[PDB]
Amino acid sequence: IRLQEDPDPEDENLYEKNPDSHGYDKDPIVDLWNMRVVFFFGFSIVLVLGSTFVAYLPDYRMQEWARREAERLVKYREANGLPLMESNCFDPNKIQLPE
Amino acid sequence: MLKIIIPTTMLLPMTWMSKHNMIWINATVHSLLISLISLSLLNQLGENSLNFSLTFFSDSLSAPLLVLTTWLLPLMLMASQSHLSKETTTRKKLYITMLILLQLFLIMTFTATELILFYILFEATLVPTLIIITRWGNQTERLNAGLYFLFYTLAGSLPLLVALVYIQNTTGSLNFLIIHYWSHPLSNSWSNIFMWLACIMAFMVKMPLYGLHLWLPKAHVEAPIAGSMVLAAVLLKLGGYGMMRITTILNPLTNYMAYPFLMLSMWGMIMTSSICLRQTDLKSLIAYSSVSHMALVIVAIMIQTPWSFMGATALMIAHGLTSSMLFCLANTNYERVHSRTMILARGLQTLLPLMATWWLVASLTNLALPPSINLIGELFIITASFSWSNITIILMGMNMMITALYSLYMLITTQRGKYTHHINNIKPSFTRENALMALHILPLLLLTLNPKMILGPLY
Amino acid sequence: AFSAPAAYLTHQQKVLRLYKRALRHLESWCVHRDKYRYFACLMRARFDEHKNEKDMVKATQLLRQAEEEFWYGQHPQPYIFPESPGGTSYERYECYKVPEWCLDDWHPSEKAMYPDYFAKREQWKRLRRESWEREVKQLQEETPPGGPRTEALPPARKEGDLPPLWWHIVTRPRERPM
Amino acid sequence: SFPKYKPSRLATLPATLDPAEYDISPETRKAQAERLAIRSRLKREYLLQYNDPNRLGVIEDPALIRWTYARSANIYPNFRPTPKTSLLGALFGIGPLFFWYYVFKTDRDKKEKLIQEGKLDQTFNISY
Amino acid sequence: DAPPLTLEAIKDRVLYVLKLYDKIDPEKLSVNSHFMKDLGLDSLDQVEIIMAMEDEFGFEIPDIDAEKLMCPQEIVDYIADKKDVYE
Amino acid sequence: SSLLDLIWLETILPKTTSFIQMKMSIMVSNQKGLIKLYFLSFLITIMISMTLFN
Amino acid sequence: PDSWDKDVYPEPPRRTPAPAPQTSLPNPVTYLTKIFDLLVDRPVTLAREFIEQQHAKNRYYYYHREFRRVPDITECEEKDILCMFEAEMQWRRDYKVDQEIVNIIQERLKACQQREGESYRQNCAKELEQFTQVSKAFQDRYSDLGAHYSARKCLAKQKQRMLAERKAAKEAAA
Amino acid sequence: HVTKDMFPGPYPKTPEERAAAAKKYNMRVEDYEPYPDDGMGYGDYPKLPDRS
Amino acid sequence: KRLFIIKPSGFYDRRFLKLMRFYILLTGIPVAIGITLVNVFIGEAELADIPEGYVPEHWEYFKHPISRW
Numbered sequence A: 001i002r003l004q005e006d007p008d009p010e011d012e013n014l015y016e017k018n019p020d021s022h023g024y025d026k027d028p029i030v031d032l033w034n035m036r037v038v039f040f041f042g043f044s045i046v047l048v049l050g051s052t053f054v055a056y057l058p059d060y061r062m063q064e065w066a067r068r069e070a071e072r073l074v075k076y077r078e079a080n081g082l083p084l085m086e087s088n089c090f091d092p093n094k095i096q097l098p099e
Numbered sequence B: 001m002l003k004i005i006i007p008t009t010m011l012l013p014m015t016w017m018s019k020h021n022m023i024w025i026n027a028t029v030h031s032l033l034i035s036l037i038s039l040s041l042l043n044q045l046g047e048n049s050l051n052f053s054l055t056f057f058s059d060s061l062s063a064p065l066l067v068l069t070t071w072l073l074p075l076m077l078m079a080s081q082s083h084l085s086k087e088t089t090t091r092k093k094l095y096i097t098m099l100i101l102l103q104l105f106l107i108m109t110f111t112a113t114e115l116i117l118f119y120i121l122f123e124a125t126l127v128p129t130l131i132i133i134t135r136w137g138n139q140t141e142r143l144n145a146g147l148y149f150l151f152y153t154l155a156g157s158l159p160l161l162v163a164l165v166y167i168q169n170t171t172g173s174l175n176f177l178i179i180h181y182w183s184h185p186l187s188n189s190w191s192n193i194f195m196w197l198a199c200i201m202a203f204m205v206k207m208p209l210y211g212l213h214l215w216l217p218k219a220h221v222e223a224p225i226a227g228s229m230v231l232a233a234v235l236l237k238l239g240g241y242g243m244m245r246i247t248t249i250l251n252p253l254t255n256y257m258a259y260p261f262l263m264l265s266m267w268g269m270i271m272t273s274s275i276c277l278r279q280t281d282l283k284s285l286i287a288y289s290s291v292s293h294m295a296l297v298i299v300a301i302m303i304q305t306p307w308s309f310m311g312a313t314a315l316m317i318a319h320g321l322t323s324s325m326l327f328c329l330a331n332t333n334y335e336r337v338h339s340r341t342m343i344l345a346r347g348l349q350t351l352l353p354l355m356a357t358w359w360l361v362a363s364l365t366n367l368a369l370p371p372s373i374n375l376i377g378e379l380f381i382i383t384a385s386f387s388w389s390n391i392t393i394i395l396m397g398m399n400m401m402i403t404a405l406y407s408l409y410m411l412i413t414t415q416r417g418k419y420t421h422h423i424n425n426i427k428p429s430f431t432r433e434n435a436l437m438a439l440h441i442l443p444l445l446l447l448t449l450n451p452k453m454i455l456g457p458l459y
Numbered sequence C: 001a002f003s004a005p006a007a008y009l010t011h012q013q014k015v016l017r018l019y020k021r022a023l024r025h026l027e028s029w030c031v032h033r034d035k036y037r038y039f040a041c042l043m044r045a046r047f048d049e050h051k052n053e054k055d056m057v058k059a060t061q062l063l064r065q066a067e068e069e070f071w072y073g074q075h076p077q078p079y080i081f082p083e084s085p086g087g088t089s090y091e092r093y094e095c096y097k098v099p100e101w102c103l104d105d106w107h108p109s110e111k112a113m114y115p116d117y118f119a120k121r122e123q124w125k126r127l128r129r130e131s132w133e134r135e136v137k138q139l140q141e142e143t144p145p146g147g148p149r150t151e152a153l154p155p156a157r158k159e160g161d162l163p164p165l166w167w168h169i170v171t172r173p174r175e176r177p178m
Numbered sequence D: 001s002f003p004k005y006k007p008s009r010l011a012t013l014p015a016t017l018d019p020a021e022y023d024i025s026p027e028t029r030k031a032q033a034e035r036l037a038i039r040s041r042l043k044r045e046y047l048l049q050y051n052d053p054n055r056l057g058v059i060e061d062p063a064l065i066r067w068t069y070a071r072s073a074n075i076y077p078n079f080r081p082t083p084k085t086s087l088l089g090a091l092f093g094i095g096p097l098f099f100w101y102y103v104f105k106t107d108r109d110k111k112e113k114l115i116q117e118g119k120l121d122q123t124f125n126i127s128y
Numbered sequence E: 001d002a003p004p005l006t007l008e009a010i011k012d013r014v015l016y017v018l019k020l021y022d023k024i025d026p027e028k029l030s031v032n033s034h035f036m037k038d039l040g041l042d043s044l045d046q047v048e049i050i051m052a053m054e055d056e057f058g059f060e061i062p063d064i065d066a067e068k069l070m071c072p073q074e075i076v077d078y079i080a081d082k083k084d085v086y087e
Numbered sequence F: 001s002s003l004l005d006l007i008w009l010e011t012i013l014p015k016t017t018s019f020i021q022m023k024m025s026i027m028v029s030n031q032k033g034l035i036k037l038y039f040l041s042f043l044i045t046i047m048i049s050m051t052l053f054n
Numbered sequence G: 001p002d003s004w005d006k007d008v009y010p011e012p013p014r015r016t017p018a019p020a021p022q023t024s025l026p027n028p029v030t031y032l033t034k035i036f037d038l039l040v041d042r043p044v045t046l047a048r049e050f051i052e053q054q055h056a057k058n059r060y061y062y063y064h065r066e067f068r069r070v071p072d073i074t075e076c077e078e079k080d081i082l083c084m085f086e087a088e089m090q091w092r093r094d095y096k097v098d099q100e101i102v103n104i105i106q107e108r109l110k111a112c113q114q115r116e117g118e119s120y121r122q123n124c125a126k127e128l129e130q131f132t133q134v135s136k137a138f139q140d141r142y143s144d145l146g147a148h149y150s151a152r153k154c155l156a157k158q159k160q161r162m163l164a165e166r167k168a169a170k171e172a173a174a
Numbered sequence H: 001h002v003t004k005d006m007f008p009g010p011y012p013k014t015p016e017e018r019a020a021a022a023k024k025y026n027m028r029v030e031d032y033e034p035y036p037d038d039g040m041g042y043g044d045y046p047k048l049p050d051r052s
Numbered sequence I: 001k002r003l004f005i006i007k008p009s010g011f012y013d014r015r016f017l018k019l020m021r022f023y024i025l026l027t028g029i030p031v032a033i034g035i036t037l038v039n040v041f042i043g044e045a046e047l048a049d050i051p052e053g054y055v056p057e058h059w060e061y062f063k064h065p066i067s068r069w
């Protein structure tokens, strides 16, 4: 031997001392409460409440507003015979081309 | 963003003042609460971003990454508490402090509004990761892995710093809004070519790009479980976010300078999938799968079309979740048998059924299985690449075939077959491990249910 | 499977294995029982014709020619018993085989569901633990100084002893475990 | 006589057709005995460890450890730049890259020429 | 599904096949009769007997183990051990 | 895996750089600590600075 | 139904042929339709009536947000950040509205194809022309702007198109 | 438990090195044969028959 | 004759599944009941023109009651 080294320790099994162990801590009470807080907070709170919050987030992307505006524009344009989509985004009168 | 930044800086003293047996409980509970608070950033506008103040802003691209980071912190806490049972109280608190500092730096990086602050923070993320790897790694190669990771990132990113200060001197501002509104075309000159190279190469090394990726297998194999989870889930997404941010000022030079990177990305995607086909180590297989997916993201960003950006963002989120779940499963297998060899342990389906179910789900999400967000992102990228050119479909099909091949090869080798006779220390799966897998997999399916939240600003 | 192999196969063993393989492939060719009986009698007639030969070189040459003829004339799809390695029912129940070490990790309630079985299991475990030292002593006493020259194991030479290395052979899972 | 069987790498030669299987030197018998002795010694060691009742865990396999180490961590120290390795590396690493570059560049040049000449069917192409 | 085998059933079936063998005299055939020492057979006859037993019971006996079965009782014991029959 | 990832991608960027830095480090640090030698070096530097810089 | 506008979402008048049986055999389809109406339609109608009665007791309203027009990028001066911001926001809103217009036209096309069925190639030629015109205009507007599109890029593209048209007209007149 | 002497090493160039390598891999000296030293990184790992 | 079937411990997997179901349904069921009650009684808003001189709020610009809240 070249050192005064400890031998490699044996692997410790949590089920030996605590057959109904959740694998969080060696202490049974702390292990049980760690399982309880993780499950409750994570699953219940985060998953369920965040999912319903995201589901019912207000339509700030203006999808339905854009649909209503498009409906009004289509109705007005096809009622008056105008093209449904104007070929230019900006006004050629307001655009000044070089000579 | 202060309502999310300050709770992390309060996580730090809480962890350092908590009892010796309550550190994990307190950290997990309050990390979950912070994630729930950060879920409120997903309410974005369709016109512009959320400008909180002069320093921080949130966008449709920044919000999913912030939510992913905040959700990822407690999972890393669970895995770390798995593998650090015998550590001393001070060292446990130091590990939790490193994780908290990494999360804080990542949040500030994603919310930063200037390119220089973004650079400072995304370089500051190196120190906690390097310390974690080189201090709590298991094998000898952790030191070499840390050196490779550090020097690859820094050699990539220093020219980015020089180019950023040059751009500020030239134009007047590094603010993202100003450089977006006041953008001017980048003429075809050698100086512009080298500026483009500096920025793109920094973020490509961060991606990583094929040929500049060996640090990724070295670090991911040799890092502890928390380091492996954070490195693949989030730290690989800094390059993609940066490239999606800086490409505003690099046009139209990107049309001419993207060919070598596109060829590298496609061919290296094929090559890394082939490498996955012949891997004797599970963590290495997962690492090279990560490289292939990030190469696909690089292709999407380089082709740079509105359909490619949405696919890139969706694929980044999906890959983060999937790679984190795969690393967790491999870590449980390793803790069972104390070795990373793939063929050492077999029959884990007849020895551990629920873990076999988790493996099946993770491998199904790893390959593009509809209607998962993985498939959504991959399909958008494939469509954009098809519009770009019509042989990219050949390359993408080859990659998909090899991806399915190696994913199912890993699943069959680890789970199916007959159990190894001499391995009799495989105890039943823990409630902690099962909860970890469930919390990895359920958000992915919920994001599949609601997909517009991870498609970025181009949606 | 249960018998330790030798260093080599003798000429008699080689010719007997060739005979059995040829008969099996002939039965594969000759589907009907009477036709198979006729041609199997002819095959054994050939073997009996060449049974008596004093020249071992000529016998080896005949064996080589017979092996080449068999390889040319073999059935591409020979009949295989369902449980044989090539069979359609091979390794079907390997997923249902669970070991006793996996059995002992049960919860106390699960163990209490089978009270009588686990008492006998504990008796078997005590019997195993009370014999290992004698087994290893017997194994190390009877081995040659150079090392084991074959995979055969000795039996129990004493009234109160068990054959060395018996636990897994005795407690291997049943062929139809579930 | 009967047509001969030609073994290949993907269809190996059966043992019963191997010419060396019927020409046994006395040294071949002692070589087989030595192989059997090695196998028996390894089997004895493994069986002792396997049937030990006080053992809990995995019987570490030195052969498996050597295989895993040689496959990954032992490649570079034993690599030398030779003409064969240099040519193979250059080919397999660079040739595909330039091949794909040429293919994609040619396709995009043809497409751009068609666009400029205005004879490419791009109607209804709204998404890109 | 199939009814379980028993030691008596296995012994009866193997003796049935052996008595149906022509080269064996049924009267002098017992469960301990050696095929070559006191029945007067040879290697090919033993191989044919093993093949007949394989056809009878629907499973294959490997050549390494088949050569050592020189007794009807040995065949019964081998079949019972392989089929996990204890009664 | 072997030829590209473990051999040539290692040789080109990270291994060659480390080798060059190690060689240069050995060359720079291989000094015998002789005042005569590095004062003659100072003299050469002075001459070069005087002549080649104007 | 009054939920949508019949002009925006046209439907041709529905001509259902009258039943003219030619056999004494009972109609299983008629019998099953009567059973379905008795067992499902009446309960769901009663439930919906109860729900709508509950709704009418707490009737409240929501409005459609109105945006006024602002000066556009053509009027904005160079590097005038506030005017550029306003013009860019207005341009993005107009882009969203145009996308929804294209969506409406596509829905019309799909509905007409399904309704006509086996005679779609002839009876849907009217909706195909409108879709062709709308797609052409939308492509000319926002065809190749890229991921970082902006009102400035759209204006530059329009200027290029106008210059090309002027050059073509001059060449034709020459 | 494996020592540094039980790991694969460089290509064996002398009969003593080849004998040591054969002993290391639990093989006979006559049956041990390394891959040709072409610089491909095999080292002293034995070349076993290409069967399955 | 009934033979003992050797199986891996399923108690822990059953316990995890039961706990996960219980904690998901602990808040899922009240949320579902609340959503159903809101939809049945406090129905969605009806689109109306803005009265002249009236300035609504953003929640008054949104439709679903939960989104407005």
Ligand SMILES: CCCCCCCCCCCCCCCCCC(=O)OC[C@H](COP(=O)([O-])OCC(O)COP(=O)([O-])OC[C@@H](COC(=O)CCCCCCCCCCCCCCCCC)OC(=O)CCCCCCCCCCCCCCCCC)OC(=O)CCCCCCCCCCCCCCCCC
Residues within 6 Å of the ligand: A047, A048, A051, A052, A055, B442, G043, G044, G046, G047, G050, G051, I020, I021, I024, I025, I027, I028, I029, I031, I032, I033, I035, I036, I039, I040, I043, I044
């Ligand atoms: C452990 C392993 C597993 C882990 C899983 C992963 C973890 C999951 C964590 C949780 C994730 C949650 C994510 C967020 C969800 C939030 C909820 C949400 O998004 O709701 C959206 C939305 C709800 O609507 P909304 O947007 O709130 O309101 C819009 C309307 O204004 C509303 O309409 P309305 O106001 O006119 O009336 C509707 C009202 C009232 O409805 C009625 O009244 C309907 C009446 C029907 C029968 C009527 C006729 C019969 C009458 C018989 C009696 C007649 C005589 C008496 C009559 C009365 C007295 C006169 O009903 C409702 O509002 C209830 C809707 C359902 C609520 C679900 C809440 C989920 C909360 C999240 C947690 C869930 C945890 C799981 C446990 C859940 C609980 C077990 O839709 C749904 O909830 C889904 C409805 C689906 C209906 C059927 C659709 C067709 C199905 C077949 C399709 C083709 C085949 C496909 C395959 C088969 C199907 C899969």
Ligand SMILES: *P(=O)(O)OCC(C)(C)[C@H](O)C(=O)NCCC(=O)NCCSC(=O)CCCCCCCCCCCCC
Residues within 6 Å of the ligand: C011, C012, C013, C015, C016, C022, C025, C026, C029, C046, C047, C050, C051, C052, C053, C059, C060, C062, C063, C066, C067, C069, C070, C073, C074, C075, E042, E043, E044
């Ligand atoms: P028991 O110990 O009595 O066994 C007697 C033996 C055979 C061992 C003798 O003692 C013995 O060794 N005799 C001399 C060696 C000898 O028998 N040589 C010749 C045997 S091979 C041969 O002559 C018969 C081969 C002919 C048939 C070949 C079958 C190939 C056709 C198969 C086609 C597949 C479908 C039908």
